[PDB]
Write an enzyme that holds these catalytic residues in place. Structure first.
Site, PDB file in Angstrom:
ATOM      1  N   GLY A 295      32.778 -10.331 -13.659  1.00 36.88           N
ATOM      2  CA  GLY A 295      33.803 -11.341 -13.881  1.00 36.88           C
ATOM      3  C   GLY A 295      33.172 -12.610 -14.433  1.00 36.88           C
ATOM      4  O   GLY A 295      33.891 -13.446 -14.953  1.00 36.88           O
TER       5      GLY A 295
ATOM      6  N   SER B  61      30.751 -12.260 -16.734  1.00 34.74           N
ATOM      7  CA  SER B  61      30.357 -11.772 -18.082  1.00 34.74           C
ATOM      8  C   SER B  61      30.952 -12.548 -19.201  1.00 34.74           C
ATOM      9  O   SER B  61      32.139 -12.884 -19.143  1.00 34.74           O
ATOM     10  CB  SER B  61      30.811 -10.303 -18.266  1.00 34.74           C
ATOM     11  OG  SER B  61      30.087  -9.530 -17.356  1.00 34.74           O
ATOM     12  N   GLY B  62      30.152 -12.790 -20.245  1.00 31.92           N
ATOM     13  CA  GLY B  62      30.664 -13.514 -21.434  1.00 31.92           C
ATOM     14  C   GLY B  62      30.528 -15.025 -21.282  1.00 31.92           C
ATOM     15  O   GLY B  62      30.591 -15.754 -22.265  1.00 31.92           O
TER      16      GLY B  62
ATOM     17  N   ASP C  17      24.538  -8.067 -27.062  1.00 29.26           N
ATOM     18  CA  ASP C  17      25.797  -8.186 -26.321  1.00 29.26           C
ATOM     19  C   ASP C  17      26.417  -9.582 -26.596  1.00 29.26           C
ATOM     20  O   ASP C  17      26.303 -10.509 -25.792  1.00 29.26           O
ATOM     21  CB  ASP C  17      25.563  -7.972 -24.824  1.00 29.26           C
ATOM     22  CG  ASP C  17      26.874  -7.839 -24.023  1.00 29.26           C
ATOM     23  OD1 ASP C  17      27.940  -7.672 -24.646  1.00 29.26           O
ATOM     24  OD2 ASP C  17      26.827  -7.870 -22.763  1.00 29.26           O
TER      25      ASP C  17
ATOM     26  N   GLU D 288      45.491 -27.638 -19.331  1.00 25.41           N
ATOM     27  CA  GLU D 288      45.206 -26.324 -19.941  1.00 25.41           C
ATOM     28  C   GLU D 288      45.744 -26.179 -21.381  1.00 25.41           C
ATOM     29  O   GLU D 288      46.747 -26.749 -21.726  1.00 25.41           O
ATOM     30  CB  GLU D 288      45.617 -25.152 -19.043  1.00 25.41           C
ATOM     31  CG  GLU D 288      45.101 -25.222 -17.626  1.00 25.41           C
ATOM     32  CD  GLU D 288      46.061 -25.934 -16.684  1.00 25.41           C
ATOM     33  OE1 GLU D 288      46.987 -26.613 -17.139  1.00 25.41           O
ATOM     34  OE2 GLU D 288      45.881 -25.810 -15.478  1.00 25.41           O
TER      35      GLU D 288
ATOM     36  N   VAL E  44      46.691 -21.660 -10.929  1.00 21.00           N
ATOM     37  CA  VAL E  44      47.569 -22.821 -10.815  1.00 21.00           C
ATOM     38  C   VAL E  44      47.552 -23.571 -12.139  1.00 21.00           C
ATOM     39  O   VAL E  44      46.486 -23.898 -12.619  1.00 21.00           O
ATOM     40  CB  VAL E  44      47.103 -23.799  -9.687  1.00 21.00           C
ATOM     41  CG1 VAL E  44      48.082 -25.041  -9.567  1.00 21.00           C
ATOM     42  CG2 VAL E  44      47.092 -23.084  -8.320  1.00 21.00           C
TER      43      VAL E  44
ATOM     44  N   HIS F 113      30.552  -6.678 -24.614  1.00 21.91           N
ATOM     45  CA  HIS F 113      31.111  -5.766 -23.567  1.00 21.91           C
ATOM     46  C   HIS F 113      32.425  -6.249 -22.945  1.00 21.91           C
ATOM     47  O   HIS F 113      33.101  -5.451 -22.271  1.00 21.91           O
ATOM     48  CB  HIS F 113      30.077  -5.329 -22.499  1.00 21.91           C
ATOM     49  CG  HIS F 113      29.908  -6.309 -21.368  1.00 21.91           C
ATOM     50  ND1 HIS F 113      28.831  -7.158 -21.302  1.00 21.91           N
ATOM     51  CD2 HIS F 113      30.665  -6.565 -20.259  1.00 21.91           C
ATOM     52  CE1 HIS F 113      28.924  -7.918 -20.228  1.00 21.91           C
ATOM     53  NE2 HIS F 113      30.022  -7.571 -19.571  1.00 21.91           N
TER      54      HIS F 113
END
Ligand SMILES: [Ca+2]
Length: 223
Positions: free
Chosen positions: A175, A177-178, A84, A62, A57, A40
């Site tokens: 937010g 989700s996943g 899902d 990262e 930030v 989804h």
């Protein structure tokens, strides 16, 4: 995450943010080239962000890598949210250290009562809206199949499980989700759905990853 705690920077090194100009779903890194999320969450234009703590930030840990391929589960049903789950292949391999790391897939399905860690950058309120900039964490137990089916009569398939608290107050939310549910150091669940967030008698429902290990391993091996 409602009612959770600030994880701490890089304490959840397999956590990813899926970004299409803004954060829109979580995911988990399962090896240097593949991410697992919820079907989804499917979107075109996905950049995968790894090693994030504050999503607003650039702090130094990262890696931002575009998706080269997305694979939604072949039996995903957007009405029932059965199956899902989706895979996302990265354009280049992530560099793995201690603050970017993969999470192992399970070999068994986890039991009711197992304590799990859930994380994400989703809404932190059960009423209203407040999205955190830093990663939140929640410890929650897996609920029995019978308590799950009584909270959601006729909606729970063998590919889902409930985790959280029947009394409400603590839950994943929009937010998240996943994102990962990790129990005993393995990826057991994917944040999938629920009725609101943290409402009494309405715990979170998660995709049961142990049912998909073969599909995931075969798909990864061939793409
Ligand atoms: Ca950041």
């Amino acid at each position: 995450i409602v009612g959770g705690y600030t994880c701490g920077a890089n304490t959840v090194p397999y956590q990813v943010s899926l970004n299409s100009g803004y954060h829109f779903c979580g995911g988990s890194l399962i090896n240097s080239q593949w991410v697992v999320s919820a079907a989804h969450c499917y979107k075109s234009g996905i950049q995968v962000r790894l090693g994030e703590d504050n999503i607003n930030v650039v702090e130094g840990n990262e890696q931002f890598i575009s998706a080269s391929k997305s694979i939604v589960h072949p039996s995903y049903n957007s009405n029932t949210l059965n199956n899902d789950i989706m895979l996302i292949k990265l354009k280049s391999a992530a560099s793995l250290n201690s603050r970017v790391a993969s999470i192992s897939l399970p070999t068994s399905c986890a039991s009711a009562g197992t304590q799990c860690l859930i994380s994400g950058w989703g809404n932190t309120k059960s009423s209203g809206t407040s999205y955190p900039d830093v990663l939140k964490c929640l410890k929650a137990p897996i609920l029995s199949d019978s308590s799950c089916k009584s909270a959601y009569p006729g909606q729970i398939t063998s590919n889902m499980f409930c985790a959280g608290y029947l009394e409400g107050g603590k839950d994943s939310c929009q937010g998240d989700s996943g994102g990962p549910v990790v129990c005993s150091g393995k990826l057991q669940g994917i944040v999938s759905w629920g009725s609101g967030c943290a409402q009494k008698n309405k715990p979170g429902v998660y995709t049961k990853v142990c049912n998909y290990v073969s599909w995931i391993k075969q798909t990864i091996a061939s793409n």
